[PDB]
Amino acid sequence: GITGTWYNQLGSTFIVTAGADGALTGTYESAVGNAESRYVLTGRYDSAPATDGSGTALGWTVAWKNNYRNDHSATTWSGQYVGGAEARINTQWLLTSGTTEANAWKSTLVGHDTFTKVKP
Amino acid sequence: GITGTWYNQLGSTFIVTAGADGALTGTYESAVGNAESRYVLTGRYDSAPATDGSGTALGWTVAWKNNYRNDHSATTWSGQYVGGAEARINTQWLLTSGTTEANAWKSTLVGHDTFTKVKP
Amino acid sequence: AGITGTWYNQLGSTFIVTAGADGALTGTYESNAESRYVLTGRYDSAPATDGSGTALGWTVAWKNNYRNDHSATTWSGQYVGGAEARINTQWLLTSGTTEANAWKSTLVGHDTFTKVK
Amino acid sequence: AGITGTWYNQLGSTFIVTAGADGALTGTYESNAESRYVLTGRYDSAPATDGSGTALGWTVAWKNNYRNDHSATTWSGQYVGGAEARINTQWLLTSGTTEANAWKSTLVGHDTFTKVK
Numbered sequence: 001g002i003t004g005t006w007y008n009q010l011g012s013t014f015i016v017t018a019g020a021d022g023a024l025t026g027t028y029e030s031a032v033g034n035a036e037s038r039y040v041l042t043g044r045y046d047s048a049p050a051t052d053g054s055g056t057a058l059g060w061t062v063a064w065k066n067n068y069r070n071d072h073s074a075t076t077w078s079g080q081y082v083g084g085a086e087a088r089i090n091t092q093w094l095l096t097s098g099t100t101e102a103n104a105w106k107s108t109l110v111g112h113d114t115f116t117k118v119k120p
Numbered sequence: 121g122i123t124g125t126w127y128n129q130l131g132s133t134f135i136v137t138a139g140a141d142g143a144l145t146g147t148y149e150s151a152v153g154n155a156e157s158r159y160v161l162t163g164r165y166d167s168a169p170a171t172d173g174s175g176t177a178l179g180w181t182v183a184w185k186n187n188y189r190n191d192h193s194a195t196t197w198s199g200q201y202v203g204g205a206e207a208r209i210n211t212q213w214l215l216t217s218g219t220t221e222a223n224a225w226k227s228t229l230v231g232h233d234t235f236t237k238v239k240p
Numbered sequence: 241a242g243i244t245g246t247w248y249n250q251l252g253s254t255f256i257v258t259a260g261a262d263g264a265l266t267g268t269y270e271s272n273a274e275s276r277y278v279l280t281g282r283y284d285s286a287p288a289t290d291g292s293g294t295a296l297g298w299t300v301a302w303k304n305n306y307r308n309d310h311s312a313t314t315w316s317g318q319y320v321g322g323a324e325a326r327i328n329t330q331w332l333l334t335s336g337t338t339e340a341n342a343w344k345s346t347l348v349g350h351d352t353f354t355k356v357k
Numbered sequence: 358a359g360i361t362g363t364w365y366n367q368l369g370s371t372f373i374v375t376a377g378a379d380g381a382l383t384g385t386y387e388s389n390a391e392s393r394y395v396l397t398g399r400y401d402s403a404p405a406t407d408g409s410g411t412a413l414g415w416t417v418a419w420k421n422n423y424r425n426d427h428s429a430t431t432w433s434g435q436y437v438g439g440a441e442a443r444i445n446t447q448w449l450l451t452s453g454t455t456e457a458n459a460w461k462s463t464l465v466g467h468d469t470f471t472k473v474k
């Protein structure tokens with residue numbers, strides 16, 4: 001149920017393939033751009049989740065460098081997939097920027113994204 | 121400077137290859153076990169970091185399933201590599217477990233790991 | 241301003257707070273008497289006038305006269321005024337643990353509070 | 358118990374706190390007078406007696422008589438007693454933002470506090 005296209009509340013889109021081995025691969029597009037806003041993503045998911053109605057744990061990373069831009073940053077999303085008629089991926093994320101040592105204390109933003117199969 | 125073996129304060133070891141394209145691949149071993157405690161990891165890093173003395177942003181994911189165990193969970197680490205004589209990868213992480221909807225509010229642990237090239 | 245009163249999150253919890261002129265937040269958090277806990281925090285009592293939210297934070301230690309969970313939650317966020325006022329937060333819930341278990345001491349999450357249930 | 362007093366973190370900040378019998382934390386955070394801010398929080402005033410830490414949290418809004426950063430930090434953690442006493446924390450720093458910038462409103466980090474600099 002994970003493979004395909006997902007949309008969050010900020011207008012971002014990612015397109016992921018969930019491999020039988022637990023790999024996540026695909027692309028993440030930040031809301032504003034087209035090709036210039038598309039970045040590689042890779043991650044992992046639980047390919048044998050519980051059958052007790054629990055979600056499926058997963059995570060992925062995007063480094064914000066592509067052939068157009070480099071924001072010297074990387075975001076990781078950690079969350080779970082919840083299936084059904086209104087499938088969701090509920091996540092929390094950490095965005096770390098490369099900083100000097102003096103600024104390391106303010107290197108990392110935290111937030112939360114909810115992804116759905118249809119645009120908000 | 122990222123490729124190789126790193127150790128954190130909990131006794132965990134990971135071994136990563138940083139690809140020229142920005143890929144991170146390797147294995148993460150939780151402290152206690154041998155093969156039963158080794159898990160696939162994948163991630164991304166900034167393959168063209170700033171040259172102003174800033175760290176190199178990166179992130180990776182481990183899903184805690186292998187051929188021996190499955191904890192129905194996944195951890196993402198977000199941080200930066202800092203080079204030099206005492207190289208470090210400074211991270212913050214999110215560990216999400218698959219949960220029922222009723223328990224989703226307590227699905228995600230947060231913490232921090234510092235990795236060095238030598239065992240603590 | 242706009243913060244004093246009763247707030248409700250998505251989980252069905254009730255946050256009753258007084259925002260003092262001095263930047264203090266005081267009140268109670270109900271997550272029945274058994275479920276009511278003291279809260280105290282701080283807010284920016286002179287926020288920007290450029291349309292930005294009002295930064296704030298508070299803590300609940302999960303001990304009252306009835307129960308003790310040996311844990312505490314802190315919420316960090318901002319108040320956003322207007323017709324559909326909100327307090328948008330992220331929180332950290334730390335449990336007392338042994339040193340061996342300290343790596344898994346802290347949960348993270350997010351709550352949105354509104355003025356209506 | 359063991360919490361009242363002065364604490365120092367790895368960044369050179371100074372945390373001066375009184376832990377009240379009722380579970381209250383009050384004091385000041387210096388991150389000079391210009392750099393001193395009010396703090397208030399809560400702690401578990403009847404912690405477990407099994408070797409677990411004592412859960413606590415506090416907030417500083419970064420406004421004082423000299424400066425206002427339109428932001429607030431909450432620390433969530435636990436006190437660990439003994440010869441080498443510590444308060445181990447993780448924190449959230451939320452800045453007031455526009456709604457457009459709210460996705461990047463909140464920094465996360467960690468501080469360790471000790472009784473000696």
Ligand SMILES: O=C(CCCC[C@@H]1SC[C@@H]2NC(=O)N[C@@H]21)NNc1c(-c2ccc(S(=O)(=O)N3CCOCC3)cc2)cccc1-c1ccc(S(=O)(=O)N2CCOCC2)cc1
Nearest residue numbers: 008010012030031032064068069070071075093095113460
């Ligand atoms: O794409 C990014 C990073 C996006 C982080 C998104 C975070 S991950 C967690 C959260 N979830 C999301 O879906 N989005 C956010 N930055 N790009 C921006 C740039 C930019 C432009 C050029 C360059 S450069 O060519 O390398 N250049 C810079 C220095 O001068 C010369 C070299 C680098 C960066 C400029 C402005 C804004 C962005 C940006 C910021 C936020 C988002 S967004 O997706 O968060 N956003 C969508 C629109 O509504 C607001 C939120 C997207 C792009």
Ligand SMILES: O=C(CCCC[C@@H]1SC[C@@H]2NC(=O)N[C@@H]21)NNc1c(-c2ccc(S(=O)(=O)N3CCOCC3)cc2)cccc1-c1ccc(S(=O)(=O)N2CCOCC2)cc1
Nearest residue numbers: 128130132150151152184188189190191195213215233343
């Ligand atoms: O390996 C894991 C998950 C590790 C999460 C580590 C987190 S990531 C963030 C932080 N950084 C680290 O390096 N470590 C921690 N769990 N395994 C444990 C199990 C276990 C055993 C069997 C199975 S099963 O076969 O699937 N089985 C379960 C149900 O019954 C039938 C099926 C599943 C899980 C049991 C006990 C403990 C662990 C565990 C927990 C913590 C760590 S640790 O690395 O955090 N740790 C090292 C030792 O000192 C304490 C900390 C390692 C393993």
Ligand SMILES: [Ca+2]
Nearest residue numbers: 071073097461
């Ligand atoms: Ca930026």
Ligand SMILES: [Ca+2]
Nearest residue numbers: 191193217344
């Ligand atoms: Ca467990």
